[PDB]
Protein backbone atom coordinates (compact mmCIF):
# COMPACT_ATOMS: atom_id res chain seq x y z
CA UNK A 1 0.00 0.00 0.00
CA UNK A 2 0.93 3.64 -0.41
CA UNK A 3 3.36 3.06 -3.27
CA UNK A 4 2.05 4.05 -6.74
CA UNK A 5 3.40 2.04 -9.68
CA UNK A 6 3.30 5.37 -11.52
CA UNK A 7 5.09 8.04 -9.49
CA UNK A 8 3.16 11.30 -9.05
CA UNK A 9 4.71 14.61 -10.07
CA UNK A 10 3.84 17.54 -7.81
CA UNK A 11 4.26 21.24 -8.63
CA UNK A 12 -9.76 21.32 -6.05
CA UNK A 13 -9.30 25.06 -6.53
CA UNK A 14 -5.83 26.17 -7.70
CA UNK A 15 -4.56 22.61 -7.87
CA UNK A 16 -3.04 20.92 -10.93
CA UNK A 17 -3.70 17.99 -13.24
CA UNK A 18 -2.25 14.76 -11.89
CA UNK A 19 -0.05 12.32 -13.78
CA UNK A 20 -2.52 9.68 -15.06
CA UNK A 21 -2.84 6.78 -12.63
CA UNK A 22 -0.36 8.25 -10.13
CA UNK A 23 -2.94 8.11 -7.28
CA UNK A 24 -4.14 4.48 -7.80
CA UNK A 25 -6.28 4.42 -4.66
CA UNK A 26 -8.42 7.36 -5.79
CA UNK A 27 -11.88 6.21 -6.83
CA UNK A 28 -14.92 8.09 -8.11
CA UNK A 29 -18.28 7.37 -6.48
CA UNK A 30 -21.08 7.63 -9.05
CA UNK A 31 -24.79 6.98 -9.25
CA UNK A 32 -26.34 4.53 -11.72
CA UNK A 33 -26.12 7.10 -14.54
CA UNK A 34 -22.41 7.75 -14.10
CA UNK A 35 -22.81 11.01 -12.17
CA UNK A 36 -19.79 11.71 -9.94
CA UNK A 37 -20.87 12.87 -6.46
CA UNK A 38 -17.88 12.02 -4.26
CA UNK A 39 -14.38 10.60 -4.18
CA UNK A 40 -13.05 7.71 -2.12
CA UNK A 41 -9.91 5.71 -1.35
CA UNK A 42 -9.28 1.99 -1.80
CA UNK A 43 -7.76 0.49 1.36
CA UNK A 44 -7.59 -3.04 -0.08
CA UNK A 45 -9.24 -4.97 -2.93
CA UNK A 46 -12.65 -5.21 -1.26
CA UNK A 47 -13.03 -1.98 0.70
CA UNK A 48 -13.28 1.74 0.02
CA UNK A 49 -13.17 4.48 2.64
CA UNK A 50 -15.12 7.69 2.00
CA UNK A 51 -17.04 10.40 3.85
CA UNK A 52 -20.28 9.70 5.70
CA UNK A 53 -21.93 12.87 4.36
CA UNK A 54 -21.60 11.53 0.81
CA UNK A 55 -24.61 9.34 1.60
CA UNK A 56 -23.46 6.41 -0.53
CA UNK A 57 -25.98 3.57 -1.01
CA UNK A 58 -25.78 0.11 -2.61
CA UNK A 59 -27.26 1.61 -5.79
CA UNK A 60 -24.13 3.70 -6.34
CA UNK A 61 -20.93 2.40 -7.91
CA UNK A 62 -17.21 2.63 -7.25
CA UNK A 63 -15.15 3.57 -10.29
CA UNK A 64 -11.47 2.65 -10.02
CA UNK A 65 -8.52 3.28 -12.30
CA UNK A 66 -10.04 6.45 -13.70
CA UNK A 67 -8.23 9.61 -14.77
CA UNK A 68 -10.26 11.40 -17.47
CA UNK A 69 -13.99 11.20 -16.74
CA UNK A 70 -14.60 12.76 -20.14
CA UNK A 71 -13.01 9.77 -21.88
CA UNK A 72 -15.51 7.04 -22.73
CA UNK A 73 -12.73 4.82 -24.13
CA UNK A 74 -10.53 4.99 -21.02
CA UNK A 75 -10.27 1.60 -19.29
CA UNK A 76 -11.76 1.58 -15.81
CA UNK A 77 -13.39 -0.75 -13.29
CA UNK A 78 -17.02 -0.13 -12.37
CA UNK A 79 -17.43 -1.95 -9.07
CA UNK A 80 -20.78 -2.60 -7.43
CA UNK A 81 -21.25 -1.97 -3.71
CA UNK A 82 -22.43 -4.89 -1.58
CA UNK A 83 -22.81 -3.04 1.71
CA UNK A 84 -22.36 0.43 3.17
CA UNK A 85 -20.98 0.90 6.67
CA UNK A 86 -21.65 4.43 7.89
CA UNK A 87 -19.93 5.17 11.20
CA UNK A 88 -22.82 5.19 13.69
CA UNK A 89 -21.14 8.09 15.50
CA UNK A 90 -21.33 10.38 12.47
CA UNK A 91 -22.87 13.62 13.75
CA UNK A 92 -25.08 15.10 11.03
CA UNK A 93 -25.14 18.37 12.97
CA UNK A 94 -21.46 18.92 13.81
CA UNK A 95 -20.15 16.80 10.89
CA UNK A 96 -17.86 14.95 13.34
CA UNK A 97 -16.85 11.33 12.64
CA UNK A 98 -17.42 11.86 8.91
CA UNK A 99 -16.46 8.42 7.64
CA UNK A 100 -18.09 5.52 5.83
CA UNK A 101 -16.76 2.19 4.60
CA UNK A 102 -17.88 0.57 1.37
CA UNK A 103 -17.64 -3.21 0.93
CA UNK A 104 -17.51 -4.15 -2.76
CA UNK A 105 -19.66 -6.91 -4.27
CA UNK A 106 -16.76 -7.98 -6.47
CA UNK A 107 -13.15 -7.30 -5.52
CA UNK A 108 -11.21 -4.72 -7.52
CA UNK A 109 -8.44 -6.05 -9.75
CA UNK A 110 -5.32 -4.26 -8.57
CA UNK A 111 -2.85 -3.14 -11.22
CA UNK A 112 -0.52 -0.33 -12.27
CA UNK A 113 -3.40 2.14 -11.97
CA UNK A 114 -5.43 0.55 -9.17
CA UNK A 115 -4.03 -0.14 -5.70
CA UNK A 116 -4.48 0.69 -2.01
CA UNK A 117 -3.49 3.61 0.18
CA UNK A 118 -1.99 2.80 3.58
CA UNK A 119 -3.92 3.41 6.79
CA UNK A 120 -2.25 5.02 9.82
CA UNK A 121 -2.07 3.71 13.37
CA UNK A 122 -4.40 5.38 15.86
CA UNK A 123 -1.30 6.64 17.68
CA UNK A 124 0.42 8.12 14.61
CA UNK A 125 1.34 11.77 14.94
CA UNK A 126 1.55 13.81 11.75
CA UNK A 127 3.13 17.13 12.69
CA UNK A 128 1.59 20.45 11.76
CA UNK A 129 3.35 21.97 8.77
CA UNK A 130 3.80 18.57 7.14
CA UNK A 131 3.25 18.86 3.39
CA UNK A 132 0.54 16.43 2.32
CA UNK A 133 -1.58 15.98 -0.80
CA UNK A 134 -5.27 15.83 -1.63
CA UNK A 135 -6.78 14.68 -4.91
CA UNK A 136 -10.15 14.59 -6.64
CA UNK A 137 -12.49 15.67 -9.42
CA UNK A 138 -14.11 18.45 -7.41
CA UNK A 139 -14.75 21.92 -8.86
CA UNK A 140 -11.63 23.91 -9.76
CA UNK A 141 -13.65 27.13 -9.47
CA UNK A 142 -16.60 27.96 -7.19
CA UNK A 143 -19.53 25.36 -12.84
CA UNK A 144 -18.87 21.75 -13.82
CA UNK A 145 -16.22 19.36 -12.51
CA UNK A 146 -12.86 18.97 -14.27
CA UNK A 147 -12.68 15.88 -16.49
CA UNK A 148 -9.16 15.00 -15.38
CA UNK A 149 -8.08 14.15 -11.83
CA UNK A 150 -6.57 17.09 -9.94
CA UNK A 151 -4.05 17.26 -7.09
CA UNK A 152 -2.73 19.86 -4.68
CA UNK A 153 0.02 19.92 -2.06
CA UNK A 154 -0.95 21.58 1.22
CA UNK A 155 0.23 21.77 4.84
CA UNK A 156 -1.41 20.19 7.86
CA UNK A 157 -2.52 22.87 10.32
CA UNK A 158 -2.33 22.67 14.11
CA UNK A 159 -5.70 22.60 15.86
CA UNK A 160 -4.80 25.91 17.50
CA UNK A 161 -4.24 27.59 14.15
CA UNK A 162 -7.34 25.99 12.64
CA UNK A 163 -9.55 27.09 15.52
CA UNK A 164 -8.29 30.64 15.01
CA UNK A 165 -10.81 30.65 12.17
CA UNK A 166 -13.35 27.86 12.79
CA UNK A 167 -13.39 28.10 16.58
CA UNK A 168 -15.39 25.42 18.37
CA UNK A 169 -16.70 23.94 15.12
CA UNK A 170 -13.49 21.88 15.01
CA UNK A 171 -14.12 18.56 16.76
CA UNK A 172 -11.85 15.69 17.87
CA UNK A 173 -12.30 13.55 14.76
CA UNK A 174 -11.35 16.45 12.47
CA UNK A 175 -7.97 17.62 11.20
CA UNK A 176 -7.31 20.78 9.18
CA UNK A 177 -5.06 21.46 6.22
CA UNK A 178 -4.75 24.20 3.62
CA UNK A 179 -5.45 27.94 3.83
CA UNK A 180 -2.36 27.95 1.63
CA UNK A 181 -3.67 28.90 -1.79
CA UNK A 182 -5.58 25.72 -2.65
CA UNK A 183 -8.93 24.30 -1.53
CA UNK A 184 -11.00 21.14 -1.79
CA UNK A 185 -14.38 21.92 -3.38
CA UNK A 186 -17.73 20.37 -4.37
CA UNK A 187 -17.05 16.88 -5.66
CA UNK A 188 -13.85 16.30 -3.68
CA UNK A 189 -15.56 15.03 -0.50
CA UNK A 190 -14.74 11.48 0.52
CA UNK A 191 -11.41 11.76 -1.27
CA UNK A 192 -7.97 11.40 0.34
CA UNK A 193 -5.61 13.72 2.18
CA UNK A 194 -2.35 11.75 2.19
CA UNK A 195 1.05 12.23 3.80
CA UNK A 196 4.15 10.04 3.61
CA UNK A 197 4.90 7.70 6.51
CA UNK A 198 8.31 6.07 6.03
CA UNK A 199 8.00 6.90 2.34
CA UNK A 200 4.54 5.37 1.91
CA UNK A 201 1.45 7.48 1.18
CA UNK A 202 -0.86 7.14 4.17
CA UNK A 203 -4.46 8.32 4.56
CA UNK A 204 -4.38 11.06 7.19
CA UNK A 205 -7.66 12.72 6.29
CA UNK A 206 -10.85 12.39 4.26
CA UNK A 207 -12.15 15.49 2.44
CA UNK A 208 -15.05 16.68 4.61
CA UNK A 209 -15.99 20.37 4.77
CA UNK A 210 -14.79 23.96 4.73
CA UNK A 211 -15.34 27.43 3.29
CA UNK A 212 -18.79 27.78 1.73
CA UNK A 213 -17.10 29.35 -1.31
CA UNK A 214 -14.05 27.07 -1.36
CA UNK A 215 -11.79 29.97 -0.37
CA UNK A 216 -8.09 29.17 -0.73
CA UNK A 217 -7.18 31.29 2.31
CA UNK A 218 -9.39 29.36 4.74
CA UNK A 219 -8.51 26.07 6.49
CA UNK A 220 -9.98 22.96 4.91
CA UNK A 221 -11.43 20.43 7.35
CA UNK A 222 -10.93 16.70 6.98
CA UNK A 223 -12.06 13.65 8.91
CA UNK A 224 -9.06 12.70 11.08
CA UNK A 225 -8.29 9.10 10.13
CA UNK A 226 -6.11 8.38 13.19
CA UNK A 227 -9.17 9.03 15.36
CA UNK A 228 -11.30 6.74 13.23
CA UNK A 229 -8.96 3.97 12.12
CA UNK A 230 -9.76 1.67 15.04
CA UNK A 231 -13.39 1.78 13.91
CA UNK A 232 -12.17 0.99 10.40
CA UNK A 233 -10.13 -2.04 11.50
CA UNK A 234 -12.95 -3.34 13.71
CA UNK A 235 -15.41 -3.04 10.83
CA UNK A 236 -13.16 -4.94 8.42
CA UNK A 237 -12.47 -7.68 10.97
CA UNK A 238 -16.18 -8.19 11.65
CA UNK A 239 -17.00 -8.23 7.93
Amino acid sequence: CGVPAIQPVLSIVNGEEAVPGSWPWQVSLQDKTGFHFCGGSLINENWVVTAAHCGVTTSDVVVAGEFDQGSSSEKIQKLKIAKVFKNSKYNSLTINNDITLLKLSTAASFSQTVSAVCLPSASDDFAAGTTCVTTGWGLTRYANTPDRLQQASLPLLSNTNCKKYWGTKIKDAMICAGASGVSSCMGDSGGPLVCKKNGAWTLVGIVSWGSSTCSTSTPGVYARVTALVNWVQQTLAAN
Binding site: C38, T145, M186, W209, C214
Partner: protein
Protein backbone atom coordinates in the same frame (compact mmCIF):
# COMPACT_ATOMS: atom_id res chain seq x y z
CA UNK B 1 -47.11 26.87 1.53
CA UNK B 2 -44.24 26.90 4.06
CA UNK B 3 -42.01 29.97 3.92
CA UNK B 4 -38.92 27.75 3.68
CA UNK B 5 -40.09 27.16 0.10
CA UNK B 6 -39.14 30.75 -0.72
CA UNK B 7 -35.52 30.40 0.43
CA UNK B 8 -32.79 30.12 -2.21
CA UNK B 9 -31.04 26.71 -2.47
CA UNK B 10 -28.35 26.04 0.13
CA UNK B 11 -25.29 23.98 -0.85
CA UNK B 12 -23.80 23.98 2.63
CA UNK B 13 -20.15 23.66 3.84
CA UNK B 14 -19.58 20.00 2.91
CA UNK B 15 -18.00 19.17 -0.43
CA UNK B 16 -20.01 16.34 -1.94
CA UNK B 17 -21.75 16.99 -5.27
CA UNK B 18 -25.26 15.66 -4.64
CA UNK B 19 -28.19 16.52 -6.90
CA UNK B 20 -31.19 17.78 -4.95
CA UNK B 21 -34.32 19.76 -5.78
CA UNK B 22 -35.49 23.12 -4.50
CA UNK B 23 -38.64 25.08 -5.20
CA UNK B 24 -38.05 28.21 -7.28
CA UNK B 25 -40.95 30.57 -6.52
CA UNK B 26 -39.93 32.81 -9.44
CA UNK B 27 -40.53 30.02 -11.96
CA UNK B 28 -43.16 28.08 -10.05
CA UNK B 29 -41.22 24.85 -10.54
CA UNK B 30 -38.76 22.71 -8.62
CA UNK B 31 -35.25 22.91 -10.03
CA UNK B 32 -32.06 20.95 -9.38
CA UNK B 33 -29.03 22.26 -7.49
CA UNK B 34 -25.81 20.90 -6.05
CA UNK B 35 -26.02 20.01 -2.36
CA UNK B 36 -22.78 19.58 -0.42
CA UNK B 37 -24.06 16.72 1.72
CA UNK B 38 -24.55 18.35 5.10
CA UNK B 39 -26.66 20.93 6.92
CA UNK B 40 -29.46 20.93 4.36
CA UNK B 41 -32.18 23.56 4.70
CA UNK B 42 -35.80 22.52 4.25
CA UNK B 43 -36.13 23.60 0.59
CA UNK B 44 -34.00 20.57 -0.33
CA UNK B 45 -35.69 17.43 -1.71
CA UNK B 46 -34.56 14.07 -3.05
CA UNK B 47 -37.11 14.12 -5.87
CA UNK B 48 -38.96 16.71 -7.91
CA UNK B 49 -42.21 15.08 -6.80
CA UNK B 50 -41.48 15.49 -3.07
CA UNK B 51 -40.56 19.10 -3.74
CA UNK B 52 -43.73 19.90 -5.72
CA UNK B 53 -45.96 18.17 -3.14
CA UNK B 54 -44.40 20.27 -0.39
CA UNK B 55 -43.79 23.62 -2.08
CA UNK B 56 -45.91 23.68 -5.23
CA UNK B 57 -47.58 27.04 -5.68
CA UNK B 58 -45.62 28.93 -3.03
Amino acid sequence: RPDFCLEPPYTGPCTARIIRYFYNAKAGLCQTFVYGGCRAKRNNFKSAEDCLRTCGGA
